[PDB]
PDB file of C-alpha atoms in Angstrom:
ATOM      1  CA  UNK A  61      34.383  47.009  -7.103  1.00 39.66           C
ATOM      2  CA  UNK A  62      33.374  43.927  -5.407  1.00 39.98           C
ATOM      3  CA  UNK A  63      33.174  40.227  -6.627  1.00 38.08           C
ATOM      4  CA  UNK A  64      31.856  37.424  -5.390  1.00 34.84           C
ATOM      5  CA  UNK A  65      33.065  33.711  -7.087  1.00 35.49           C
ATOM      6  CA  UNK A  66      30.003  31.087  -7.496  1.00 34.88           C
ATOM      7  CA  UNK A  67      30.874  27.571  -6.878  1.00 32.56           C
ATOM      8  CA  UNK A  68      30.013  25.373  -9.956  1.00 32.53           C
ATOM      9  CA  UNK A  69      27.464  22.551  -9.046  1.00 33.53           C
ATOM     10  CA  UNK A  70      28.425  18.855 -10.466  1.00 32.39           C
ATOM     11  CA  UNK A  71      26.426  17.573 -13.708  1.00 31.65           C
ATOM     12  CA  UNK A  72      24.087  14.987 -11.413  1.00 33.39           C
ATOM     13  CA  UNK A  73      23.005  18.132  -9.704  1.00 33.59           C
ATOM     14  CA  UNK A  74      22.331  19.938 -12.889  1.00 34.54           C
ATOM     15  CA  UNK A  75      20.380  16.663 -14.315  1.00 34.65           C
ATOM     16  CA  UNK A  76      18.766  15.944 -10.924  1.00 34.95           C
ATOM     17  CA  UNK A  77      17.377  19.466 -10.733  1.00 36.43           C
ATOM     18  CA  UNK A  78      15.987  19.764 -14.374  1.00 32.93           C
ATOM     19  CA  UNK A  79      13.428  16.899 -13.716  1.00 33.86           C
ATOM     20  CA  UNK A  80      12.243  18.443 -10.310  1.00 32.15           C
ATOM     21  CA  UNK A  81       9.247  19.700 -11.422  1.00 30.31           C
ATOM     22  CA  UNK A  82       7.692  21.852 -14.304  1.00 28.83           C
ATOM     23  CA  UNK A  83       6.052  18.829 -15.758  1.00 26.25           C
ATOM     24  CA  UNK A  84       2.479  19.226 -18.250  1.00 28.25           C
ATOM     25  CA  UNK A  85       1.540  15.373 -17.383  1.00 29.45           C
ATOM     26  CA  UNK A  86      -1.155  16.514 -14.450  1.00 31.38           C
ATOM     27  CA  UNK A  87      -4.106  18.558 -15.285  1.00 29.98           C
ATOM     28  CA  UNK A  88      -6.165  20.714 -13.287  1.00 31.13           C
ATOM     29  CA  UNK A  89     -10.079  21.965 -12.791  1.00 30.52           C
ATOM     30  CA  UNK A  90     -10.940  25.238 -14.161  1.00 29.88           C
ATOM     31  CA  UNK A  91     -13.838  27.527 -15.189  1.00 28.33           C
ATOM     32  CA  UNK A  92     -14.891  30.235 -17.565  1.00 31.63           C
ATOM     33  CA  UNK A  93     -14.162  34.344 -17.204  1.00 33.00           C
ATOM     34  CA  UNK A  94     -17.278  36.277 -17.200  1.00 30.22           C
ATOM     35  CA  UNK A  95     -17.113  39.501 -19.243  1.00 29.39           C
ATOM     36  CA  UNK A  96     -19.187  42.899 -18.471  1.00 29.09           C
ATOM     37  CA  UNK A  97     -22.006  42.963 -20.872  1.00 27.88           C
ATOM     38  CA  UNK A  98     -23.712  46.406 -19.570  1.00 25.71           C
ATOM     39  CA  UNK A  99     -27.452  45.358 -21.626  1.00 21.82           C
ATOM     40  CA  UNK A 100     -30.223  47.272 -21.787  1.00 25.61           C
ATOM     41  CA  UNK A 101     -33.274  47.839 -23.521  1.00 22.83           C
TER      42      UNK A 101
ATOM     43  CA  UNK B   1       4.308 -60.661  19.939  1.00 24.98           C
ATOM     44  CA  UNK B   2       1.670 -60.328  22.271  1.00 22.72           C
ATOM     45  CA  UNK B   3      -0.845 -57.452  23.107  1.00 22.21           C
ATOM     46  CA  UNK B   4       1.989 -55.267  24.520  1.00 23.79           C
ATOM     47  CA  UNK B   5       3.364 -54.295  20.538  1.00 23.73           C
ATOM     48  CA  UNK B   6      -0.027 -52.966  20.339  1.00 26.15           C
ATOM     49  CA  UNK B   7       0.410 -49.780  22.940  1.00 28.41           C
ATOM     50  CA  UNK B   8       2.381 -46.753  20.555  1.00 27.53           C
ATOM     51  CA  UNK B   9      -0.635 -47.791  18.258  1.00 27.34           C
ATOM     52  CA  UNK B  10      -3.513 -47.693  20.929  1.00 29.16           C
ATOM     53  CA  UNK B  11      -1.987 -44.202  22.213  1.00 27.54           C
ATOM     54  CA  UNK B  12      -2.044 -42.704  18.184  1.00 27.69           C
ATOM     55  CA  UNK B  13      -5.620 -43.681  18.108  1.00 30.85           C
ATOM     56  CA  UNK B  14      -6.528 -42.397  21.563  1.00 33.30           C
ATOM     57  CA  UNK B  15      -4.357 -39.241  21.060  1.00 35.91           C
ATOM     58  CA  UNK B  16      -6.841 -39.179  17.822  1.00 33.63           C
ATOM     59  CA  UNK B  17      -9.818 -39.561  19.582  1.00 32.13           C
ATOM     60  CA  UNK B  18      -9.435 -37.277  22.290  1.00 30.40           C
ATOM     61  CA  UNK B  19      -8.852 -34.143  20.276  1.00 33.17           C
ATOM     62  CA  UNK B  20     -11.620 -35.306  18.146  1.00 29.39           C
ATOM     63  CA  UNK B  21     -14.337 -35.077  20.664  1.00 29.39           C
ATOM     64  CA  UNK B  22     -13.100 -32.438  22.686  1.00 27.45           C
ATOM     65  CA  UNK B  23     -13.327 -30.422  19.416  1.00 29.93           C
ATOM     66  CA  UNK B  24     -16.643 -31.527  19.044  1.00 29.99           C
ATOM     67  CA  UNK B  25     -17.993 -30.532  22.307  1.00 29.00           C
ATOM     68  CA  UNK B  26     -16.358 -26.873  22.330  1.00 27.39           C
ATOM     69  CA  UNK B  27     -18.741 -23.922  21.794  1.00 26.89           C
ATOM     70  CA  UNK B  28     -17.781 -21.446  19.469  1.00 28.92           C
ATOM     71  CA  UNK B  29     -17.655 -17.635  19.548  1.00 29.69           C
ATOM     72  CA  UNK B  30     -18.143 -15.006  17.059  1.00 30.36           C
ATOM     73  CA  UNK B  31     -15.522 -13.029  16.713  1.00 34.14           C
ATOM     74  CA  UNK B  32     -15.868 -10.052  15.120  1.00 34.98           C
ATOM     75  CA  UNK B  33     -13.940  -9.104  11.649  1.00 35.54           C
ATOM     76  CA  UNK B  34     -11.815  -5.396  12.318  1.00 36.48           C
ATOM     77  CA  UNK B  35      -8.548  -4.172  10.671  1.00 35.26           C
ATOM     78  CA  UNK B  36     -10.178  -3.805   7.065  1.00 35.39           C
ATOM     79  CA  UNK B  37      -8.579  -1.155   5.255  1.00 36.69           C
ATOM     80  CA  UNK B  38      -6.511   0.232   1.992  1.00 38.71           C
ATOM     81  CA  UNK B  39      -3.163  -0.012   3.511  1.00 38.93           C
ATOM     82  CA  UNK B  40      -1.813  -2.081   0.489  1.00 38.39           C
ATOM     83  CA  UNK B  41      -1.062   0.333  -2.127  1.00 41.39           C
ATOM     84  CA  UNK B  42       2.079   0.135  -4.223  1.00 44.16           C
ATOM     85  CA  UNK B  43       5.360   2.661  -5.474  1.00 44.65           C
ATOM     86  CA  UNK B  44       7.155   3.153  -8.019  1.00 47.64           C
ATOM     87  CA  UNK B  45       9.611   5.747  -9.648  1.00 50.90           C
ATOM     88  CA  UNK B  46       7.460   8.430 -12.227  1.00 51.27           C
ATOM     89  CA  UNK B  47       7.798   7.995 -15.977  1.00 51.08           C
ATOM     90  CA  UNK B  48       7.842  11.523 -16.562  1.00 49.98           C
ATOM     91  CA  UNK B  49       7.313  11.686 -20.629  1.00 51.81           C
ATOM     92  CA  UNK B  50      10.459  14.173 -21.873  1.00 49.92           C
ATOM     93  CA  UNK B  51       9.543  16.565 -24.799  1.00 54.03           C
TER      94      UNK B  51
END
């Protein structure tokens, strides 16, 4: 029973905030998962 | 024309002469080089490849 009205943003905004971030240009270090093997003999 | 058109002359070459060997007889100290860092980098705006 209530509303509340959102204020539109202008298109600049819109376009400034799409190129923020969220970018796949800079990598990052990682390493391999180990997985439980359980051997025996 | 006499020996007194000589004097701006004489005072050029003693003017010359005196800074000459006053240089020469100065003793020198070695200052030491500081202030030697990578404080010259440059900016830009980001290319940013769209896709």
């Amino acid at each position: 029973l209530d509303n509340v009205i959102k204020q539109i943003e202008a298109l600049s905004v819109i376009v400034n905030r799409s190129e923020k971030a969220d970018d796949a240009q800079i990598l990052g270090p990682n390493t391999y998962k180990q997985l439980l093997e359980h051997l025996f003999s | 024309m006499a020996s007194t058109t000589r004097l701006v002359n004489d005072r050029k070459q003693l003017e010359q002469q005196v800074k000459d060997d006053a240089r020469i007889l100065a003793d020198a100290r070695g200052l030491n080089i500081t202030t030697v860092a990578n404080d010259s980098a440059t900016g830009g705006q980001a290319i940013r490849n769209v896709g």
